[PDB]
């Protein structure tokens, strides 16, 4: 998949495309409908399936540093867009182009001149152009005879509107199971394992910037995977195997994620590690003794073992290769 | 109007004065009664109307950095004192003088030797001298035959005691209309417009230190005035005209004030700008899309247009020259 | 009393000891039972009474910087351990030794090889060894024929479990009288008096790090003692006399303690000062005038005078030499 | 004078203009030649004289946080531009436009489409468009028959090249006299007076100012100069009028960690200028920074700075060309 | 290769080993002699080659925050060790063990009890146990009949002693050529690419990296080198493959206050490497740091760095011994 | 000895006093002459010997944050004053009083009204009152018949002027021997011991102290000196008594950013002094600061500092005049 930064980077010789436009934060199940429709039409005509997306977040252009939290990083947005069949991602920076542009000139510049689009697929909530006056309905009429437009209703399921907004709310509530439900996969973060405490001490510590969306402080059951690597691994964990883990999300009074991998002793310093969240286990608490702390640690392991045993049975969610022991 | 810092700066040849003493933060309607009485008596005898005030706040002398928030800056206190006819302001720093001094020696030093006072006007809540043992009643008796004293009752109106304390409470509640009511004018702040976001982007951004009193975070209707200047102004705003504005007061997680001037495109970087608050519009909120943000922005403009149309009719409050459009 | 840091520092020629093991934070009344039993048995056999304690807090080894607040500093723990007759304190750093060690090897290494113990005294909540699998019951069986073990029930009094945890809760609630009740003495902090405001201004200002346990923000009645010194004292306070004081505990938005010594004018800059807490007086509040501030200051002095007059009558709590005036 | 941010803010009904393009930092005597040529042309043909300038600095666009120090603020660049008769300033942000543009495209879009220019005036060192490919020459060949191009040599005077660079160099060494000479005026900073060590005059300056680290300042030291209280109806504590240049000894310092300060000791006045906006003009270097160990020593040196200043300023008044119309200066204490 | 933290993590069923002990910072040509001897022995007798190394640095244990800069990270020390055939790394923390231990006790506990060693290999400068009492000699006398001891002289080559110290010295002056020569490879750092001034290429590097102050870096300046995108299935913006060394001009800077940066300008590609892990290999010094006052000047010097780099890298490819198997380098633009 | 903050704190029933006025920073041999004259007079006529001193430093009042470093703290100034028999210290804050006062007014208010002085003793460099107008001479003419004035020349000895300034100079270069000689005692700092790298002795100092940036410290380096545990009933970990001066090698450092540290390696003892107040006396410079790359090297140099210290301290004991009454020092390890 090509990734282009700004309209000028798009090849001039690209002759046909089917295009979808959004922030696409999280690439949730709504987002998947748009991508699915776009990919299929691209295949039909033998053109490229293009996603136009935005970075920085368009909200942060108008209201700096009050951008909504990033459900996925830009890099993961690319990975997800690819896994669903996107051929090219065009990334638009509104501080550089397409802000002052009118609905008419936007379609003309972006969709025709730049992307050579025969098809465009947007959500009903789609807006574009100076002061967001462009709508889905605008787009259908401005594209009359020029290109075909398919406007897709926002995904409603089980009485919940599935959007970036609702995924963020669930995450903020610590309800990762509903977030997972809206995303169509286990919510995850990835990052390098740092030195933590030293070398009840966690299998892995990671830190995330405050723009990263994360589950409420608390303890979750989930899976930890050492991303593909030739680097030596200290201990009895292997790369590319999803290992059962009790996960503590905390706030330095910058958010930390501490992972206790069940039934393994490893030290993951230096490695890049994926943490997938499955279910909530408990709220954060203060500890006043080593005894009390380990007691609670063990109850977390038991509850985690239980939740993940269930998770495995929903195998559309569960990883390919996992490691989960029946007991200690 | 002269401004003197400390007793030693007061001219030795000043032969007669009518004096009022207080913090005078905000110069609210109570404060105006004291100034009014003082100015009138000065005119009667042909003497100078003097305000004795204090900086730093006397509270911060005893309890550093737990001083009450400043309703007005010291500079604005001077401006307000002048606009009401004060001839001289004596500023007392209690870390330098008049702290260890007894009620008797205070009247002797400040009122007689320094100020040559024939009249003194204080509020009923007035205290002075070592450990604030001096009262209004003390002052009348210590001044027997030496100078005349007029003690003015605190202003009570509409079931509210009008004081610096109550103005601060209203501001903190986001109730600027009641604060305006107690002040006798639109509450305002002034300051240089800084670079903000770049060059839905606000007409002006200002920053204030944390000792400055400000309305609760939220959006207010008000008026913005470019203070007199020969500097070129980018855009279609003119100096000295009060322009209709939706005002956002925020906190950097130092307080910011962001102003959206209605129906104008200007950039006010470099200019000194007054922001007058008229009425509350809404609480702060997070935005998750550009669409949602602009929707709400437009409702704020509508509600603001409405509030200011009313404000103009209370013309004792409203500015001399304003700019308010009937619609977009 | 000897203080040894780590097992290697303990003299090799020490031939007999009676040993007690715990964090001992606060040396509360439960802790006193263990020490009492240990001291008595040491006297019986003519051996040394040893306390094994821990630093850093064992909790902070597993969960860095989420250690419980220190009721006493390590230095005060030593002082208290001594005042109750302990002959030697062995301080264990779990980041250096005794973490990976099994229950069996722990008793063998610490109690026998290092300490030459004929008696060991622990609380029922006592744990030891890798993953705290060692218990009081373990210890009795592993010590069969090797040394005698006396396991002491946690102290329950007046429906309250007396522990480090409960002392912290009381302190956090601002309930110093119950904390004092559980400690068996007035809760206190000690520290150098710093420059504060200048040279209603407090008799003394002290600052404490955020790991120090302190009463809730508010005003307390208590006693202030200038620790033994040959340094000149500014004012009419003498060292080693416990002086009546209204005490303000605050938070810089690092905790401060501001002390108003009743009926004295002293300046304690440079001196080391003990602050003992007796009872709660009021919550923190903002002040808006010097008048209001002094009014409240005076009510605090009255209420304090009252509480301390009562305190003196419970003379097991009250200091040897105090200073409390009947009135102003 | 109008100020437009971006080519999209330019009035669309602009039929004719004489344009000059550059960073214009400091508006030095070199820059004035460019502006002069442009204004004199515009004034001739009833058209508007436009300046195309750049904010943020093109270097900061390419090398973030490593741009040269600003000789003037953007606000002052506007004010100086207007003072020399420019009718419009167009501020280009290179992160937003005219960056990936070819020399040919740059001319058509900016100079024709946006500005509708009949004349253009640039420095011989002028480079434009992607990878600075366009030069003073490129401009002449591309513009044929459409608009007259006037290329102007960089100003050399007294064996010294007059550029933003040399001005920065002069300032940096504390040589304000050479900086002023290259600028065609007294170098100055403008700023609100802040609270000092306190209000009101054993020790205290008349005025305290702080400046960000992007602001070009003379080397740390003491200088002779003039302070002017910017126009205001707000009252002044002490015996100073607004809009009069007052003789001052000016101390430029750096903060222990934090930023630069400017402390002004106005000669033969006690006043406290907290609350006001103040212009500080530098005339000549007086001495390097020193450490003080006693109050007497500091007061002694203080009195020497007042004498040195008094003299240097007396010469500056006689050299008339740079001094202010109305001022205040006493021959002796 | 296994990694054990502390003597308690070592498999208890370890019957035979050839051991080498040292900080091993940088794994320079001196260190390789130690590892080589050890591996060649272990490989002979079917036993495991163990490295005993130390983290945190023994100096930081004795003098907190005053340890020498790390030539490589601990992660890279492991990777380099494994690359030379070490089977096990035992990481000793001196705050945790082997500190108050006597020479005699150190041998029995570590070398016999823990590691069950039949061979040991150390440098002539080797010191062990409490107060560094044990020396290369002590080791031989204590180990008699139990294990064979092979003491190896510090590597001298071309009149230069090859040690962590001299490597740090070389790096510090910007002499990467001598550092590489003493290392036996191109000096390198590894790190995630961060966001620059923005995404996508007037000014911007191909890649931006930041490094902590414990990381040894060449003196501030420009260098010729190779950048490699570490293995990944993640897509790459632009025309660059993972696992190919690409020619780059590399700029090493310090931050105004904060830390070190490494900016990579990959020759004849525009790509944006945000999100990837990137290895940057240093070949030769190109120039010292300079200040820029104009966009043209910076682009001019930029083009000169590309030429210098192109040449230096051409020589590095010919000197083959240190260059990478697969790479990308063009003779001209 | 009484301590009064402000003229209003002075007992109103003070009928007679001999007064000396000055900053008195460091209480050096010059200052002792002033105090001696004053005490010897007061002691004669049954009156109190008063010191008028100043806090904050008069320079910091005039030039905030640019006062000279404090040779001693205000606490130590009091203690030193009392040690030389001063009965009362009056601390004047120039932000609060005696600032706008005329020479004539200063005498009447402070010397007569407040202190009721019959004798006064000042240095020839003495200046008092608004704009330092009053000098040593002014004082004599204003005081006639009311109080006897004794002006004392600044102390010159061995071609060296003894002043706060020169003491600061000596300290700054690391020449504690000359500082001590000018002071008439071992220079010292006093402070609570903080936690080091940890508790208890491979590497670790006996004691760690930190000092603010207003505190005068010898140049970074190693020094010979004595450490004394200030009087206490609190237990001491290790084999050290309170109130005994113990031989120590003393390392003075600066923090990477943050502040100064003082680390004390007490000779032939292991003790941990966390929790105690400790006095550290400097005797002689041992060496400049160095960087360490290996544990052996640091221990080697460590042992050399112990030898150098042992010798220098042996000489200091023989020169008796400055050494302490009770001390602890061993001839060899």
Q: CATH number of the domain at A283, please.
A: 2.40.30.30
SS3 D303: helix
Paired with E285 in beta bridges are E223
In a shared domain, residues E171 and E201: no
Q: Which of C164, C186, C208 is the last residue of a domain?
A: C186
Structural domain range at position E44:
1-186
Cβ–Cβ under 8 Å, residues A152 and A122: yes
The answer for B 37-76 residues in CB contact with C (under 8 A) is: 58-59, 61-64, 66, 68
Q: How many independent structural domains does chain D possess?
A: 2
What DSSP string runs through D167-194? HHHHHHHT-HHHHHHHHTS-EEEEEE-B
Paired with A205 in beta bridges are A194, A258
Structure tokens at F276: 């105690």
Q: Which of D205, D253, D294, D306 to mutate against chain F (most F CBs within 10 Å)?
A: D294
Q: Which of D235, D237, D232, D329 is nearest to D283 (CA)?
A: D329
Structure tokens at D270: 């006690």
In a shared domain, residues C17 and C135: yes
SS3 B220: strand
Structure tokens at E78: 């492991």
Whether C19 is in a domain gets the answer: yes
Cβ–Cβ under 8 Å, residues F24 and F77: yes
| Contact residues, chain D, for E258 at CB < 8 Å | none
How many CB atoms are located within 10 Å of the residue E137 CB? 12
Placement of tokens 């100086």 in the chain: D80
In a shared domain, residues D204 and D179: no
Cβ burial of A53 (10 Å; 0-12, 13-18, 19+) is buried
Placement of tokens 């282009």 in the chain: A4
Q: Which alpha helices (DSSP H) does E87-149 contain, by range? A: 103-106, 136-142
Q: Which of C176, C144, C143, C182 is nearest to C160 (CA)?
A: C182
In a shared domain, residues C165 and C105: yes
Roughly what angle, to the nearest 10 degrees, separates helices C164-172 and C176-183?
A: 160
Q: Is D96's Cβ below 8 Å from some Cβ in A?
A: yes
Can you tell me the distance from the alpha carbon of D298 to that of D306, in angstroms, rounded to the nearest whole number? 12
Question: Do B199 and D93 lie within an 8 Å CB cutoff?
Answer: yes
Question: Do C95 and E100 lie within an 8 Å CB cutoff?
Answer: no
Can you tell me the distance from the alpha carbon of D207 to that of F170, in angstroms, rounded to the nearest whole number? 36
Question: Do F197 and E94 lie within an 8 Å CB cutoff?
Answer: no
All chains having 3 or more CB pairs closer than 8 angstroms to chain F: B, C, D, E
Q: Which of A250, A254, A291, A292 to mutate against chain C (most C CBs within 10 Å)?
A: A291
**This structure's resolution (angstroms)?**
2.5
| F302: nearest CA partner in chain E | E131
Q: Which of A123, A156, A186 is the last residue of a domain?
A: A186
Whether E333 is in a domain gets the answer: no
Cβ–Cβ under 8 Å, residues A239 and A229: yes
Structure tokens at D122: 């640039």
Cβ–Cβ under 8 Å, residues D228 and D214: no
3-state secondary structure F129-193: CHHHCECHHHHHHHCCCCCEEEEECCCEECCEECCHHHHHHHHHHCCHHHHHHHHCCCEEEEEEC
Cβ–Cβ under 8 Å, residues C252 and C214: no
Q: Which of C293, D64, D139, D296 is nearest to E292 (CA)?
A: D64
Cβ burial of A211 (10 Å; 0-12, 13-18, 19+) is middle
Structure tokens at D30: 């070199």
Q: Is C198's Cβ below 8 Å from some Cβ in B?
A: yes
User: Measured between CA atoms, how close is A11 to chain B, in angstroms?
Assistant: 29
In a shared domain, residues D86 and D173: yes
The answer for D 272-311 residues in CB contact with F (under 8 A) is: 291-296, 298-299
The phi, psi pair for F277, rounded to 5°, reads -95, 135
Nearest to D62 among E256, E291, E295 (CB): E295
Question: Which residues are within 8 A (CB) of D5 and not within 5 positions of it... i.e. 6 or more apart?
Answer: B199, B234, B267, D91, D93
Q: Which of A132, A147, A162 is nearest to A54 (CA)?
A: A132
D200 membership: H or E segment, kind and range: none
Cβ–Cβ under 8 Å, residues C222 and C275: yes
Nearest to D100 among A8, A95, A100 (CB): A8
- Contact of chains D and C by CB distance (3 or more pairs under 8 angstroms): no
Question: Do E96 and C95 lie within an 8 Å CB cutoff?
Answer: yes
Q: Which of D186, D205, D220 is the last residue of a domain?
A: D186
Cβ–Cβ under 8 Å, residues D110 and D72: no
Whether C82 is in a domain gets the answer: yes
Question: Which residues are within 8 A (CB) of F137 and not within 5 positions of it... i.e. 6 or more apart?
Answer: none
The vertex-B80 CA angle with B79 and B85, nearest 5°, equals 95
Q: Which of D195, D196, D290, D295 to mutate against chain F (most F CBs within 10 Å)?
A: D295
The Cα-based distances of E116 to A235, E49, E119 in angstroms read 20, 12, 9
In a shared domain, residues C151 and C225: no
User: Measured between CA atoms, how close is E290 to chain F, in angstroms?
Assistant: 26
CATH number, domain with residue B115 = 3.40.50.620
Structure tokens at E100: 């108050």
- Contact of chains E and C by CB distance (3 or more pairs under 8 angstroms): yes
Structure tokens at A303: 């509850």
How many CB atoms are located within 10 Å of the residue C144 CB? 9
Taken in order C94, C96, C102, C104, the sign of the CA dihedral is negative
Can you tell me the distance from the alpha carbon of C66 to that of B328, in angstroms, rounded to the nearest whole number? 57
Structure tokens at C297: 């200051």
| Contact residues, chain F, for E101 at CB < 8 Å | none
Q: What's the DSSP call for residue B104? A: H
Can you tell me the distance from the alpha carbon of F149 to that of F136, in angstroms, rounded to the nearest whole number? 9
Can you tell me the distance from the alpha carbon of A179 to that of A317, in angstroms, rounded to the nearest whole number? 12
In a shared domain, residues F302 and F193: yes
In a shared domain, residues B94 and B243: no
Cβ burial of D183 (10 Å; 0-12, 13-18, 19+) is buried
Can you tell me the distance from the alpha carbon of C250 to that of B48, in angstroms, rounded to the nearest whole number? 45
Can you tell me the distance from the alpha carbon of B240 to that of B224, in angstroms, rounded to the nearest whole number? 9
| E82: nearest CA partner in chain A | A232
In a shared domain, residues C15 and C35: yes
The Cα-based distances of D238 to B140, D269, D277, D280 in angstroms read 33, 8, 15, 18
**Chain centre to alpha carbon of residue D168:** 11
Whether F333 is in a domain gets the answer: no
| B91: nearest CA partner in chain D | D199
Q: What's the DSSP call for residue A111? A: I
Question: Do A96 and D95 lie within an 8 Å CB cutoff?
Answer: yes
- Contact of chains E and B by CB distance (3 or more pairs under 8 angstroms): no
Question: Do C288 and B68 lie within an 8 Å CB cutoff?
Answer: yes
In a shared domain, residues A236 and A248: yes
Cβ–Cβ under 8 Å, residues D9 and D95: no
What DSSP string runs through D13-50? T---EEEEES--TT--HHHHHHHHHHHHHHHHTT-EEE
Pairing of strands D187-192, C242-251: unpaired
All chains having 3 or more CB pairs closer than 8 angstroms to chain A: B, C, D, E
Whether D333 is in a domain gets the answer: no
User: Measured between CA atoms, how close is F178 to chain D, in angstroms?
Assistant: 19
First to last CA, chain A: 44
| D70: nearest CA partner in chain E | E293
Whether C328 is in a domain gets the answer: no
Placement of tokens 């000016």 in the chain: D250
**Number of cross-chain residue pairs from D and F with Cβ atoms under 8 Å apart:** 42
The vertex-E28 CA angle with E26 and E32, nearest 5°, equals 120
In a shared domain, residues A46 and A146: yes
In a shared domain, residues D156 and D275: no
3-state secondary structure chain C: CEEEECHHHCCCCCCCEEEEECCCCCCCHHHHHHHHHHHHHHHHHCCEEEEEEECCCHHHHHCCCCCCCECCCHHHHHHHHHHCCCCEEEEECCCCCCCCCCHHHHHHHHHHHHCCEEEEEEECCCCECHHHCECHHHHHHHCCCCCEEEEECCCEECCEECCHHHHHHHHHCCCHHHHHHHHCCCCEEEEECECECECCCCCEEEEECCCECCCCCEEEEEEEEECCCCCCCEECCCCCCEEEEEEEEEECCCEEEEEEECCCCEECCCCEEEEEEEEEEECCCCCCCHHHHHHHHHHHHHHHHHHHHHHHHCCCCCCCCEECCCCC
The phi, psi pair for A221, rounded to 5°, reads -85, 140
User: Measured between CA atoms, how close is F195 to chain C, in angstroms?
Assistant: 11
User: Would you mind telling me the total number of residues written for chain F in this entry?
Assistant: 333
| Contact residues, chain C, for A199 at CB < 8 Å | none
Segment C281-286 long-range contacts (CB within 8 Å, at least 24 positions apart): C281/C218, C281/C219, C281/C220, C281/C221, C281/C246, C281/C307, C282/C218, C282/C219, C283/C174, C283/C217, C283/C218, C283/C219, C284/C217, C284/C218, C284/C219, C284/C248, C284/C250, C286/B66, C286/B68
Q: Is F255's Cβ below 8 Å from some Cβ in D?
A: no
| Contact residues, chain C, for B132 at CB < 8 Å | 290-291, 294
**Number of cross-chain residue pairs from A and E with Cβ atoms under 8 Å apart:** 72
A208, A213, A217, A219 alpha-carbon torsion, rounded to 10°: -90
Taken in order E241, E243, E244, E247, the sign of the CA dihedral is positive
The answer for C 143-182 residues in CB contact with A (under 8 A) is: 164-165, 168
A295, A299, A305, A306 alpha-carbon torsion, rounded to 10°: 160
Q: Is C199's Cβ below 8 Å from some Cβ in B?
A: no
F45 membership: H or E segment, kind and range: none
Question: Do D100 and E298 lie within an 8 Å CB cutoff?
Answer: no
| D7: nearest CA partner in chain A | A100
How many CB atoms are located within 10 Å of the residue F165 CB? 16
Q: Which of E58, E65, E94, E102 to mutate against chain F (most F CBs within 10 Å)?
A: E58
User: Measured between CA atoms, how close is E141 to chain A, in angstroms?
Assistant: 34
A170, A175, A178, A184 alpha-carbon torsion, rounded to 10°: 90
Structure tokens at C100: 């990976």
Nearest to C127 among A197, A200, A290 (CB): A290
Whether D120 is in a domain gets the answer: yes
Whether D290 is in a domain gets the answer: yes
E123 membership: H or E segment, kind and range: strand E117-123
Question: Which residues are within 8 A (CB) of A159 and not within 5 positions of it... i.e. 6 or more apart?
Answer: none
**Number of cross-chain residue pairs from C and F with Cβ atoms under 8 Å apart:** 72
Can you tell me the distance from the alpha carbon of E55 to that of A195, in angstroms, rounded to the nearest whole number? 12
User: Measured between CA atoms, how close is B53 to chain F, in angstroms?
Assistant: 18
Structure tokens at C301: 């002095």
Question: Do D62 and E296 lie within an 8 Å CB cutoff?
Answer: no
Can you tell me the distance from the alpha carbon of C188 to that of C277, in angstroms, rounded to the nearest whole number? 6
**Chain centre to alpha carbon of residue D211:** 14
């Amino acid at each position: 998949m090509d990734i282009w930064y700004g309209t000028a980077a798009v090849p001039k010789d690209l002759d046909n495309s089917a295009v979808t436009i959004g922030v696409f934060d999280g690439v949730h199940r709504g987002h998947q409908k748009l991508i699915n429709a776009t990919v299929e039409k691209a295949r039909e005509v033998g053109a490229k399936a293009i996603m136009v997306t935005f970075d920085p977040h368009p909200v942060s252009v108008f209201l700096p540093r009050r951008a909504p939290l990033g459900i996925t990083t830009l890099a993961e947005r690319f990975a997800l867009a690819e896994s669903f069949g996107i051929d090219g991602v065009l990334v638009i920076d509104f501080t550089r182009e397409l802000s002052g542009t009118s609905p008419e000139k936007y379609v003309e510049f972006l969709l025709e001149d730049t992307l050579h689009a025969s098809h465009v697929v947007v959500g009903a909530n789609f807006t574009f152009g100076e002061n967001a006056a462009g709508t889905a309905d605008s787009l259908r009429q401005i594209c009359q005879s020029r290109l075909t437009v398919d406007v897709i209703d926002l995904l409603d399921d089980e009485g919940v509107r599935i959007s970036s907004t609702t995924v963020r709310e669930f995450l903020s509530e610590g309800d990762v199971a509903r977030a997972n439900w809206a995303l169509g996969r286990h919510f995850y973060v990835t990052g390098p394992v740092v030195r933590g405490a030293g070398r009840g001490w966690p299998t892995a510590n990671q830190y995330f910037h405050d723009t990263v969306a994360l589950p409420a402080d608390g303890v979750y059951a989930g899976w930890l995977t050492i991303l593909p690597t030739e680097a030596p691994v200290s201990g009895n964990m292997e790369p590319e195997v999803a290992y059962a883990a009790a996960i503590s999300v905390g706030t330095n009074p910058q958010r930390s994620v501490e992972s206790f991998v069940l039934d393994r002793d490893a030290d993951l310093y230096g490695h890049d590690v994926k943490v997938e969240f499955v279910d909530h286990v408990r709220a954060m608490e203060k500890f006043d003794s080593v005894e009390q702390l380990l007691e609670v640690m063990a109850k977390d392991v038991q509850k985690t073992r239980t939740l993940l045993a269930q998770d495995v049975q929903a195998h559309k969610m569960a990883p390919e290769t996992y490691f989960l022991q029946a007991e200690s």
